[PDB]
């Protein structure tokens, strides 16, 4: 009958300007209002934010706009002695302190097929890219940078698409930076270097050159932003896991505690 909370980012991490506070619980939360009341967030410099639930075990908190660089954030999840709904009580209290780094926003514009990385507003890299072809397009919107892998296999069956089917794949890639839980990454794609900057050929990922992918891996960090614009796709879902910023502020602020 006890629930354990887990908070991210990790204690002492430096994260980008898009990183939300995330609190996950190992059990479904019956009284979201009680959970929100138990979570205290302090920021310096102080900024307004609000809670929004991504599913039955995970709540997020962010400001209306991306964090200012240098912001220090303290999170206190005080669920000991708190009835989180239906007599499920917090197993413990949990705290985290984190800081915001430089503002790094990389914009991939399907009109030019270039992914341009800006650091505190200045262009530092312009990479030709090949995004999702028209039958398997990359969604537009704001994506938060998640984990980074020097090598991994992306397998479409993770996402309910059989590897044997027309949009299926089981693909080894180097220098892969995850930007959605729906399976978009920026990664090395030596097989699409001809097409990069000209033609979209992927199932949704942002293919770039091996040197550009390794540069991205080396220089972009969790919470940095990639914004995709002008593709033939829809918009990344606000509840993706890394698509929080696609939910308009008025809806986020209003919340869904019920
Ligand atoms: N394999 C393609 C893109 C990955 C597919 C992914 N975005 C998805 O959500 O289906 C490529 O990298 O060339
Ligand atoms: N099957 C891989 C693509 C995986 C994604 O794309 C290719 O044709 O190069």
mmCIF file of C-alpha atoms and ligand atoms in Angstrom:
data_model
loop_
_atom_site.group_PDB
_atom_site.id
_atom_site.type_symbol
_atom_site.label_atom_id
_atom_site.label_comp_id
_atom_site.label_asym_id
_atom_site.label_seq_id
_atom_site.Cartn_x
_atom_site.Cartn_y
_atom_site.Cartn_z
ATOM 1 C CA UNK A 1 0.000 0.000 0.000
ATOM 2 C CA UNK A 2 2.996 2.389 -0.292
ATOM 3 C CA UNK A 3 4.069 4.256 -3.511
ATOM 4 C CA UNK A 4 7.684 5.369 -4.223
ATOM 5 C CA UNK A 5 8.203 8.702 -6.075
ATOM 6 C CA UNK A 6 11.059 9.219 -8.526
ATOM 7 C CA UNK A 7 12.169 12.602 -9.706
ATOM 8 C CA UNK A 8 14.104 13.777 -12.771
ATOM 9 C CA UNK A 9 16.301 15.475 -13.713
ATOM 10 C CA UNK A 10 18.929 13.911 -11.546
ATOM 11 C CA UNK A 11 20.383 15.694 -8.485
ATOM 12 C CA UNK A 12 23.063 18.124 -9.651
ATOM 13 C CA UNK A 13 22.457 17.660 -13.380
ATOM 14 C CA UNK A 14 22.937 20.515 -15.827
ATOM 15 C CA UNK A 15 20.090 20.348 -18.372
ATOM 16 C CA UNK A 16 18.872 22.364 -21.318
ATOM 17 C CA UNK A 17 16.216 25.037 -21.430
ATOM 18 C CA UNK A 18 13.422 22.619 -22.363
ATOM 19 C CA UNK A 19 13.816 20.068 -19.529
ATOM 20 C CA UNK A 20 10.613 19.675 -17.438
ATOM 21 C CA UNK A 21 10.487 18.551 -13.889
ATOM 22 C CA UNK A 22 9.230 15.014 -13.908
ATOM 23 C CA UNK A 23 7.795 13.081 -10.980
ATOM 24 C CA UNK A 24 6.992 9.414 -11.586
ATOM 25 C CA UNK A 25 5.384 7.015 -9.103
ATOM 26 C CA UNK A 26 5.547 3.220 -9.104
ATOM 27 C CA UNK A 27 1.754 2.991 -8.624
ATOM 28 C CA UNK A 28 -1.209 4.721 -10.350
ATOM 29 C CA UNK A 29 -2.109 7.871 -8.472
ATOM 30 C CA UNK A 30 -5.830 8.060 -7.539
ATOM 31 C CA UNK A 31 -5.770 11.629 -6.157
ATOM 32 C CA UNK A 32 -3.689 13.800 -8.504
ATOM 33 C CA UNK A 33 -4.571 16.885 -6.444
ATOM 34 C CA UNK A 34 -2.992 15.444 -3.314
ATOM 35 C CA UNK A 35 0.157 14.583 -5.361
ATOM 36 C CA UNK A 36 0.500 18.083 -6.738
ATOM 37 C CA UNK A 37 0.070 19.632 -3.252
ATOM 38 C CA UNK A 38 2.923 17.379 -1.938
ATOM 39 C CA UNK A 39 5.372 18.644 -4.629
ATOM 40 C CA UNK A 40 7.149 21.915 -3.986
ATOM 41 C CA UNK A 41 9.229 23.544 -6.691
ATOM 42 C CA UNK A 42 11.419 26.543 -6.075
ATOM 43 C CA UNK A 43 13.303 28.352 -8.813
ATOM 44 C CA UNK A 44 15.943 30.985 -8.875
ATOM 45 C CA UNK A 45 15.399 33.315 -10.518
ATOM 46 C CA UNK A 46 11.709 32.703 -9.594
ATOM 47 C CA UNK A 47 9.419 31.766 -12.498
ATOM 48 C CA UNK A 48 5.776 30.644 -12.576
ATOM 49 C CA UNK A 49 5.053 26.980 -13.667
ATOM 50 C CA UNK A 50 2.321 24.368 -13.410
ATOM 51 C CA UNK A 51 1.687 20.665 -13.303
ATOM 52 C CA UNK A 52 0.333 18.485 -16.163
ATOM 53 C CA UNK A 53 -0.110 14.700 -15.993
ATOM 54 C CA UNK A 54 1.274 12.667 -18.919
ATOM 55 C CA UNK A 55 -0.322 9.430 -17.668
ATOM 56 C CA UNK A 56 -1.636 7.904 -14.407
ATOM 57 C CA UNK A 57 1.843 7.720 -12.883
ATOM 58 C CA UNK A 58 3.743 10.697 -14.108
ATOM 59 C CA UNK A 59 3.352 14.368 -13.629
ATOM 60 C CA UNK A 60 5.410 17.145 -15.216
ATOM 61 C CA UNK A 61 6.078 20.726 -14.207
ATOM 62 C CA UNK A 62 7.385 23.529 -16.384
ATOM 63 C CA UNK A 63 7.173 27.332 -16.949
ATOM 64 C CA UNK A 64 5.294 28.900 -19.847
ATOM 65 C CA UNK A 65 8.503 29.576 -21.775
ATOM 66 C CA UNK A 66 11.826 27.692 -21.951
ATOM 67 C CA UNK A 67 13.970 28.145 -18.810
ATOM 68 C CA UNK A 68 16.376 31.024 -18.602
ATOM 69 C CA UNK A 69 20.044 29.765 -18.657
ATOM 70 C CA UNK A 70 21.565 29.683 -15.164
ATOM 71 C CA UNK A 71 18.293 28.986 -13.391
ATOM 72 C CA UNK A 72 18.639 26.858 -10.312
ATOM 73 C CA UNK A 73 15.682 24.570 -9.489
ATOM 74 C CA UNK A 74 14.912 22.738 -6.262
ATOM 75 C CA UNK A 75 12.329 20.044 -6.076
ATOM 76 C CA UNK A 76 10.874 18.570 -2.902
ATOM 77 C CA UNK A 77 8.488 15.628 -3.245
ATOM 78 C CA UNK A 78 7.013 15.340 0.274
ATOM 79 C CA UNK A 79 4.757 12.303 0.039
ATOM 80 C CA UNK A 80 5.521 10.721 3.398
ATOM 81 C CA UNK A 81 2.263 10.763 5.373
ATOM 82 C CA UNK A 82 0.284 11.907 2.249
ATOM 83 C CA UNK A 83 -2.721 9.855 1.097
ATOM 84 C CA UNK A 84 -2.107 9.861 -2.674
ATOM 85 C CA UNK A 85 -5.692 8.526 -3.137
ATOM 86 C CA UNK A 86 -7.535 5.374 -2.036
ATOM 87 C CA UNK A 87 -5.203 4.885 0.988
ATOM 88 C CA UNK A 88 -1.975 4.606 -1.025
ATOM 89 C CA UNK A 89 0.639 6.479 0.913
ATOM 90 C CA UNK A 90 4.070 7.860 -0.063
ATOM 91 C CA UNK A 91 6.909 5.461 0.777
ATOM 92 C CA UNK A 92 9.369 8.385 1.245
ATOM 93 C CA UNK A 93 10.314 11.993 0.471
ATOM 94 C CA UNK A 94 12.664 12.767 -2.438
ATOM 95 C CA UNK A 95 14.512 15.872 -3.373
ATOM 96 C CA UNK A 96 16.487 17.061 -6.397
ATOM 97 C CA UNK A 97 18.535 20.213 -7.215
ATOM 98 C CA UNK A 98 19.387 21.005 -10.826
ATOM 99 C CA UNK A 99 20.603 23.871 -13.000
ATOM 100 C CA UNK A 100 19.887 25.135 -16.464
ATOM 101 C CA UNK A 101 22.725 25.407 -18.938
ATOM 102 C CA UNK A 102 23.112 27.307 -22.201
ATOM 103 C CA UNK A 103 20.142 27.782 -24.510
ATOM 104 C CA UNK A 104 20.623 25.337 -27.331
ATOM 105 C CA UNK A 105 17.813 25.165 -29.940
ATOM 106 C CA UNK A 106 18.214 23.281 -33.188
ATOM 107 C CA UNK A 107 15.655 23.982 -35.900
ATOM 108 C CA UNK A 108 15.082 21.526 -38.744
ATOM 109 C CA UNK A 109 13.124 23.320 -41.542
ATOM 110 C CA UNK A 110 11.693 20.962 -44.176
ATOM 111 C CA UNK A 111 11.697 23.920 -46.660
ATOM 112 C CA UNK A 112 15.550 24.005 -46.642
ATOM 113 C CA UNK A 113 16.367 20.494 -45.262
ATOM 114 C CA UNK A 114 18.898 22.044 -42.892
ATOM 115 C CA UNK A 115 19.095 21.485 -39.135
ATOM 116 C CA UNK A 116 20.636 24.705 -37.689
ATOM 117 C CA UNK A 117 21.922 24.590 -34.104
ATOM 118 C CA UNK A 118 21.868 27.960 -32.221
ATOM 119 C CA UNK A 119 23.607 28.377 -28.856
ATOM 120 C CA UNK A 120 22.312 31.494 -26.917
ATOM 121 C CA UNK A 121 20.945 32.739 -30.214
ATOM 122 C CA UNK A 122 24.055 32.373 -32.352
ATOM 123 C CA UNK A 123 24.368 29.790 -35.223
ATOM 124 C CA UNK A 124 27.125 27.296 -34.459
ATOM 125 C CA UNK A 125 26.395 24.460 -36.936
ATOM 126 C CA UNK A 126 24.237 24.063 -40.053
ATOM 127 C CA UNK A 127 23.702 20.364 -40.939
ATOM 128 C CA UNK A 128 22.010 19.006 -44.110
ATOM 129 C CA UNK A 129 19.355 16.579 -43.028
ATOM 130 C CA UNK A 130 17.042 14.008 -44.558
ATOM 131 C CA UNK A 131 13.795 13.637 -42.513
ATOM 132 C CA UNK A 132 10.776 11.329 -42.826
ATOM 133 C CA UNK A 133 9.720 10.667 -46.393
ATOM 134 C CA UNK A 134 6.195 11.702 -47.307
ATOM 135 C CA UNK A 135 4.623 8.325 -46.498
ATOM 136 C CA UNK A 136 6.368 8.267 -43.083
ATOM 137 C CA UNK A 137 6.839 11.956 -42.264
ATOM 138 C CA UNK A 138 8.484 13.550 -39.282
ATOM 139 C CA UNK A 139 5.991 15.458 -37.154
ATOM 140 C CA UNK A 140 6.386 19.130 -36.706
ATOM 141 C CA UNK A 141 6.808 20.642 -33.255
ATOM 142 C CA UNK A 142 9.078 21.089 -30.300
ATOM 143 C CA UNK A 143 11.013 18.081 -29.161
ATOM 144 C CA UNK A 144 13.066 17.869 -25.946
ATOM 145 C CA UNK A 145 16.485 16.068 -26.183
ATOM 146 C CA UNK A 146 16.542 12.897 -24.163
ATOM 147 C CA UNK A 147 19.156 10.126 -23.987
ATOM 148 C CA UNK A 148 22.235 9.692 -26.262
ATOM 149 C CA UNK A 149 23.786 6.424 -27.551
ATOM 150 C CA UNK A 150 27.078 5.889 -29.273
ATOM 151 C CA UNK A 151 25.484 2.920 -31.037
ATOM 152 C CA UNK A 152 22.030 1.339 -30.853
ATOM 153 C CA UNK A 153 19.519 -0.636 -32.958
ATOM 154 C CA UNK A 154 16.234 1.129 -33.725
ATOM 155 C CA UNK A 155 13.589 -1.550 -34.335
ATOM 156 C CA UNK A 156 10.177 -0.526 -35.605
ATOM 157 C CA UNK A 157 8.363 -3.313 -33.683
ATOM 158 C CA UNK A 158 9.082 -1.206 -30.525
ATOM 159 C CA UNK A 159 6.509 1.144 -31.987
ATOM 160 C CA UNK A 160 3.947 -1.500 -33.200
ATOM 161 C CA UNK A 161 5.259 -1.669 -36.776
ATOM 162 C CA UNK A 162 6.434 -5.162 -37.707
ATOM 163 C CA UNK A 163 10.004 -5.259 -39.092
ATOM 164 C CA UNK A 164 8.731 -7.274 -42.012
ATOM 165 C CA UNK A 165 6.084 -4.711 -43.063
ATOM 166 C CA UNK A 166 6.535 -1.877 -45.586
ATOM 167 C CA UNK A 167 7.340 0.818 -42.951
ATOM 168 C CA UNK A 168 9.346 -1.645 -40.791
ATOM 169 C CA UNK A 169 13.097 -1.454 -40.002
ATOM 170 C CA UNK A 170 15.704 -2.916 -37.685
ATOM 171 C CA UNK A 171 18.541 -0.500 -38.071
ATOM 172 C CA UNK A 172 22.018 -0.144 -36.499
ATOM 173 C CA UNK A 173 22.958 3.550 -36.076
ATOM 174 C CA UNK A 174 25.879 5.425 -34.555
ATOM 175 C CA UNK A 175 25.729 8.651 -32.576
ATOM 176 C CA UNK A 176 22.012 8.597 -31.864
ATOM 177 C CA UNK A 177 20.340 11.365 -29.868
ATOM 178 C CA UNK A 178 16.732 10.540 -28.850
ATOM 179 C CA UNK A 179 14.235 13.404 -29.266
ATOM 180 C CA UNK A 180 10.868 11.632 -28.919
ATOM 181 C CA UNK A 181 9.577 8.581 -27.139
ATOM 182 C CA UNK A 182 7.755 7.859 -30.431
ATOM 183 C CA UNK A 183 11.199 6.934 -31.816
ATOM 184 C CA UNK A 184 12.572 10.057 -33.488
ATOM 185 C CA UNK A 185 16.321 10.481 -33.151
ATOM 186 C CA UNK A 186 19.019 12.598 -34.746
ATOM 187 C CA UNK A 187 21.608 10.088 -35.829
ATOM 188 C CA UNK A 188 24.446 9.222 -38.211
ATOM 189 C CA UNK A 189 23.155 8.060 -41.605
ATOM 190 C CA UNK A 190 25.960 7.464 -43.975
ATOM 191 C CA UNK A 191 23.337 5.785 -46.349
ATOM 192 C CA UNK A 192 21.472 9.076 -46.890
ATOM 193 C CA UNK A 193 24.372 11.553 -47.351
ATOM 194 C CA UNK A 194 23.337 12.074 -51.017
ATOM 195 C CA UNK A 195 19.768 12.917 -49.978
ATOM 196 C CA UNK A 196 20.621 15.028 -46.944
ATOM 197 C CA UNK A 197 19.860 18.679 -47.689
ATOM 198 C CA UNK A 198 17.687 17.673 -50.713
ATOM 199 C CA UNK A 199 15.242 14.822 -50.227
ATOM 200 C CA UNK A 200 13.532 13.218 -47.265
ATOM 201 C CA UNK A 201 14.147 9.497 -47.128
ATOM 202 C CA UNK A 202 13.757 8.354 -43.504
ATOM 203 C CA UNK A 203 10.954 6.757 -41.444
ATOM 204 C CA UNK A 204 10.854 9.908 -39.300
ATOM 205 C CA UNK A 205 14.309 10.293 -37.867
ATOM 206 C CA UNK A 206 16.550 13.278 -38.604
ATOM 207 C CA UNK A 207 19.369 11.694 -40.637
ATOM 208 C CA UNK A 208 22.579 13.700 -40.695
ATOM 209 C CA UNK A 209 26.203 12.993 -41.735
ATOM 210 C CA UNK A 210 28.371 10.834 -39.438
ATOM 211 C CA UNK A 211 30.477 13.886 -38.427
ATOM 212 C CA UNK A 212 27.430 16.060 -37.802
ATOM 213 C CA UNK A 213 25.771 13.248 -35.684
ATOM 214 C CA UNK A 214 28.907 12.811 -33.584
ATOM 215 C CA UNK A 215 29.053 16.673 -33.151
ATOM 216 C CA UNK A 216 25.423 16.632 -31.990
ATOM 217 C CA UNK A 217 26.016 13.791 -29.612
ATOM 218 C CA UNK A 218 29.126 15.596 -28.171
ATOM 219 C CA UNK A 219 27.540 19.007 -27.807
ATOM 220 C CA UNK A 220 23.757 18.723 -27.191
ATOM 221 C CA UNK A 221 22.541 17.649 -23.740
ATOM 222 C CA UNK A 222 19.301 16.399 -22.156
ATOM 223 C CA UNK A 223 16.687 19.192 -22.194
ATOM 224 C CA UNK A 224 18.056 21.017 -25.214
ATOM 225 C CA UNK A 225 15.418 21.614 -27.937
ATOM 226 C CA UNK A 226 14.940 20.489 -31.481
ATOM 227 C CA UNK A 227 12.109 22.205 -33.317
ATOM 228 C CA UNK A 228 10.858 20.732 -36.576
ATOM 229 C CA UNK A 229 8.973 23.011 -38.955
ATOM 230 C CA UNK A 230 7.217 22.937 -42.324
ATOM 231 C CA UNK A 231 7.038 19.089 -42.752
ATOM 232 C CA UNK A 232 3.991 17.304 -44.240
ATOM 233 C CA UNK A 233 3.360 15.589 -40.886
ATOM 234 C CA UNK A 234 1.137 16.510 -37.956
ATOM 235 C CA UNK A 235 2.386 17.781 -34.564
ATOM 236 C CA UNK A 236 4.211 15.661 -32.029
ATOM 237 C CA UNK A 237 1.716 14.783 -29.194
ATOM 238 C CA UNK A 238 2.064 16.810 -25.999
ATOM 239 C CA UNK A 239 2.000 13.532 -24.067
ATOM 240 C CA UNK A 240 4.715 11.834 -26.115
ATOM 241 C CA UNK A 241 7.213 11.904 -23.139
ATOM 242 C CA UNK A 242 9.416 14.571 -24.788
ATOM 243 C CA UNK A 243 6.637 16.674 -26.453
ATOM 244 C CA UNK A 244 5.511 18.733 -23.361
ATOM 245 C CA UNK A 245 6.054 22.070 -25.076
ATOM 246 C CA UNK A 246 3.503 21.275 -27.835
ATOM 247 C CA UNK A 247 0.703 21.695 -25.255
ATOM 248 C CA UNK A 248 -0.372 25.422 -25.269
ATOM 249 C CA UNK A 249 0.272 27.183 -21.950
ATOM 250 C CA UNK A 250 -3.432 27.873 -21.222
ATOM 251 C CA UNK A 251 -4.175 24.183 -21.443
ATOM 252 C CA UNK A 252 -0.994 23.176 -19.536
ATOM 253 C CA UNK A 253 -1.602 25.758 -16.707
ATOM 254 C CA UNK A 254 -5.213 24.613 -16.341
ATOM 255 C CA UNK A 255 -3.964 21.140 -15.679
ATOM 256 C CA UNK A 256 -5.649 17.782 -15.594
ATOM 257 C CA UNK A 257 -5.731 16.841 -11.898
ATOM 258 C CA UNK A 258 -9.486 16.337 -12.618
HETATM 259 N N1 LIG B 1 14.846 4.758 -39.966
HETATM 260 C C1 LIG B 1 14.499 6.168 -40.318
HETATM 261 C C2 LIG B 1 13.767 7.009 -39.309
HETATM 262 C C3 LIG B 1 13.347 6.365 -38.001
HETATM 263 C C4 LIG B 1 11.922 6.146 -37.877
HETATM 264 C C5 LIG B 1 11.299 6.818 -36.672
HETATM 265 N N2 LIG B 1 11.298 8.234 -36.645
HETATM 266 C C6 LIG B 1 9.821 6.563 -36.463
HETATM 267 O O1 LIG B 1 9.268 7.196 -35.569
HETATM 268 O O2 LIG B 1 9.222 5.752 -37.189
HETATM 269 C C7 LIG B 1 15.976 6.581 -40.541
HETATM 270 O O3 LIG B 1 16.710 6.847 -39.666
HETATM 271 O O4 LIG B 1 16.520 6.601 -41.648
HETATM 272 N N1 LIG B 2 16.105 0.301 -43.642
HETATM 273 C C1 LIG B 2 16.995 1.514 -43.588
HETATM 274 C C2 LIG B 2 16.261 2.672 -42.875
HETATM 275 C C3 LIG B 2 15.824 2.650 -41.304
HETATM 276 C C4 LIG B 2 15.261 4.063 -41.029
HETATM 277 O O1 LIG B 2 15.306 4.508 -42.188
HETATM 278 C C5 LIG B 2 17.499 1.962 -44.996
HETATM 279 O O2 LIG B 2 16.877 1.673 -46.043
HETATM 280 O O3 LIG B 2 18.553 2.599 -45.120
#
